[PDB]
């Protein structure tokens, strides 16, 4: 849409008030002109047909309960872009300021979100397992990070390279949640998962085993479901990433933590420079060590913490 950039206010899924960037042209649209080639949010109207309608509002005020998921998808897509640009110098998911598109209210009681190759899609949940998925900043950044991976390493969605794909999403969605200082933690989807249960999450980075995910290479899932456990085996990597950043002793192997900033820097460098579509866990180790070496020197503590970490999780 062509119009005048303006700023609206709304309430998110969690009931929090925020300003969003909008465009005025008879109606007020959920189109943000300030970021790259724009951030566009659509209404899928409980159907599966994408992207749906560009979100239009009569008064620039988004306080209706139907508005909730749109506010958040729009806003959190903004923060995600900001993180990439500010922290890693990357303009949008393609590095060329490509427009970011999101559709909310996808299907009925749909318990998931996804990057479909060209845009993000967000179900509303069934109201018990999940509430509208775009209310989790880590969920929004996990998904957009799949766009980043597609344009860089291109990790195939299956077996070890898909577990890596999943882990990078989890890593960068956590980094974005810390970046925004939105009650940060090392958990995935805690804000939108099981509105009746407190203190749970979909996956843990600090302790993947809490939910039954492997925290060691010897415990890796060798089957068929979940594209060969792309969401299961990612826990081996998430654990490794957690240890590099925070430190700890895991299975008798001690890791000195080097912090989240440096973790983000080594991982982004591995993703953009060393990983390929077919990379396996052992190639991720090599890619991380080499990124750490490039940045900090072969004899750095950084390099030493990356090796420990992988050693702690049984990767090589």
* Residues labelled catalytic: 143, 231
Which residue in 37, 57, 207, 226 binds Ca ion (CB under 5 A)?
57
Task: Find which of ligand INC, Zn ion, Ca ion, none residue 32 binds, CB within 5 to 8 Å per kind.
Answer: none
Burial of 163 (0-12, 13-18, 19+ CB in 10 A): buried
**Is 181 near Ca ion (CB under 5 A)?**
no
**Sign of the C-alpha dihedral, residues 110, 111, 115, 117?**
negative
- 31: helix, coil or strand? strand
**Is 143 near ligand INC (CB under 6 A)?**
yes
d(CA 183, CA 83): 16
**Is 185 near Ca ion (CB under 5 A)?**
yes
d(CA 302, CA 307): 9
**Is 211 near ligand INC (CB under 6 A)?**
no
d(CA 107, CA 29): 22
Stretch that binds Zn ion, among 20-28, 166-174, 189-197, 209-217 (CB under 5 A): 166-174
**Is 114 near ligand INC (CB under 6 A)?**
yes
d(CA 275, CA 74): 30
Stretch that binds Zn ion, among 43-51, 148-156, 162-170, 259-267 (CB under 5 A): 162-170
C-alpha 250 chain-centroid distance:
25
Residues 145-174, interacting with ligand INC (CB under 6 A) = 146
**Is 108 near Ca ion (CB under 5 A)?**
no
Q: Least separation, in Å, of the C-beta of 193 and Ca ion?
A: 5
Please count the residues of this chain forming the interface with Zn ion, following the rule CB under 5 A: 1
**Is 61 near Ca ion (CB under 5 A)?**
yes
d(CA 306, CA 310): 6
Q: Which one, of 144, 163, 164, 166, lies nearest residue 270 by Cα?
A: 164
Which residue in 169, 245, 290, 308 binds Zn ion (CB under 5 A)?
169
Cite the DSSP H helix spans in the chain. Answer: 68-88, 137-151, 159-180, 225-229, 234-246, 260-269, 281-296, 301-312
Q: In what order do the strands lie in the sheet with 4-11?
A: 56-57, 27-29, 17-25, 4-11, 61-62
**Is 143 near Ca ion (CB under 5 A)?**
no
Cβ distance to ligand INC smaller for residue 142 or 262: 142
Residues in the annotated binding site for Zn(2+): 142, 146, 166
Task: Find which of ligand INC, Zn ion, Ca ion, none residue 258 binds, CB within 5 to 8 Å per kind.
Answer: none
Q: Least separation, in Å, of the C-beta of 166 and ligand INC?
A: 6
Residues in the annotated binding site: 57, 59, 61, 138, 142, 146, 166, 177, 183, 185, 187, 190, 193-194, 197, 200
Where on the chain is the footprint of Zn ion (CB under 5 A)? 169
């Amino acid at each position: 849409i062509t119009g005048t950039s303006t700023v609206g206010v709304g309430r998110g899924v969690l009931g929090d008030q925020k300003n969003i960037n909008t465009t005025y042209s008879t109606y007020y649209y959920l189109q943000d002109n300030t970021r790259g080639d724009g951030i566009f949010t659509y209404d899928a109207k409980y159907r599966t047909t994408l992207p749906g309608s560009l979100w239009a509002d009569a008064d620039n005020q988004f306080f209706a309960s139907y508005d909730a998921p749109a506010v958040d998808a729009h806003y959190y897509a903004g923060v995600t872009y900001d993180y990439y640009k500010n922290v890693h110098n990357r303009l949008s998911y393609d590095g060329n300021n490509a427009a970011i598109r999101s559709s909310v209210h996808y299907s009925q009681g749909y318990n998931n979100a996804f990057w479909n190759g060209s845009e993000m899609v967000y179900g509303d949940g069934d109201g018990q397992t999940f509430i509208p998925l775009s209310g989790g900043i880590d969920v929004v950044a996990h998904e957009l990070t799949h766009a980043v991976t597609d344009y860089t390493a291109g990790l195939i969605y299956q077996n070890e390279s898909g577990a890596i794909n999943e882990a990078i999403s989890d890593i960068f969605g956590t980094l974005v949640e810390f970046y925004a200082n939105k009650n940060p933690d090392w958990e995935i989807g805690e804000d939108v998962y099981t509105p009746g249960i407190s203190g749970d999450s979909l996956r843990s980075m600090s302790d993947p085993a809490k939910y039954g995910d492997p925290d060691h290479y010897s415990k890796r899932y060798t089957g068929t479901q979940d594209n060969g456990g792309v969401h299961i085996n990612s826990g081996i990597i998430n654990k490794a990433a957690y240890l590099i950043s925070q430190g700890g002793t895991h299975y008798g192997v001690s890791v000195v933590g080097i912090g989240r900033d440096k973790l983000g820097k080594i991982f982004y460098r591995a993703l953009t420079q060393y990983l390929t579509p077919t990379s396996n866990f052992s190639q991720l180790r090599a890619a991380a060590v080499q990124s750490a070496t490039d940045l900090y020197g072969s004899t750095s503590q950084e390099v030493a913490s990356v090796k420990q970490a992988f050693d702690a999780v049984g990767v090589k």
